[PDB]
């Protein structure tokens, strides 16, 4: 889901 991509971007900026 394209809609999920920015959630992962957000997550990998955290860690």
């Amino acid at each position, epitope marked *: 889901n394209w809609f999920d*991509i920015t959630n992962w971007l*957000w997550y990998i900026k955290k860690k």
Partner: antibody
Amino acid sequence: QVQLVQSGAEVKRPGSSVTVSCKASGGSFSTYALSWVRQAPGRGLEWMGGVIPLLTITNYAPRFQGRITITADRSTSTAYLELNSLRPEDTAVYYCAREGTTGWGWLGKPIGAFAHWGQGTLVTVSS
Amino acid sequence: EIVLTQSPGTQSLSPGERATLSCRASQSVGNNKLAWYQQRPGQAPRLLIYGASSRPSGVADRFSGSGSGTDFTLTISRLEPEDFAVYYCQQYGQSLSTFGQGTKVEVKR
């Protein structure tokens, strides 16, 4: 606070191409999804497609695939919708919309749903 | 493609009445990725509910969303004068996002 400001109304000839712009301020431009939604006069909302600027990844609704281009310019925080081969049925108000975020501020976890809307751009296809 | 059905397309209700608006999906909506928007004439849509039941800050708590899978409901506990407007559901559980056709809540007299 996130603010989306669109270019002004435009009259376009049948068969021509229109470019609509959406300039964003506040929040993050590159890491949140920006979509375009249109509304023909007296009709409902229709999602057309979107872009994630950091990754230059677009996502088009099948019924517009081959007739639209969405692009993003990080230097100006501006997104663009191109719609080609215009017909009278393309007369509509075109909205840009950016997904919301959770928590305080505007740099939180994205929510997918469209919290932030431009003011709309009326595109009238006419001779 | 997920087709969202909002029926009826119009509801005539009295000020102060409770409103329940249905949104039914042609197939299960992934991760309850279902939103509701309000739109008044001449204005841009406004987000009321996301993720089926989550309410952004600033949105009045008389608006509540419920449901899962294919069956979703927007409830307005008590209609204020500004609540007479058009309401859209939207699913974003697939890369192809779609809207319902909208339900106009108008004043019964």
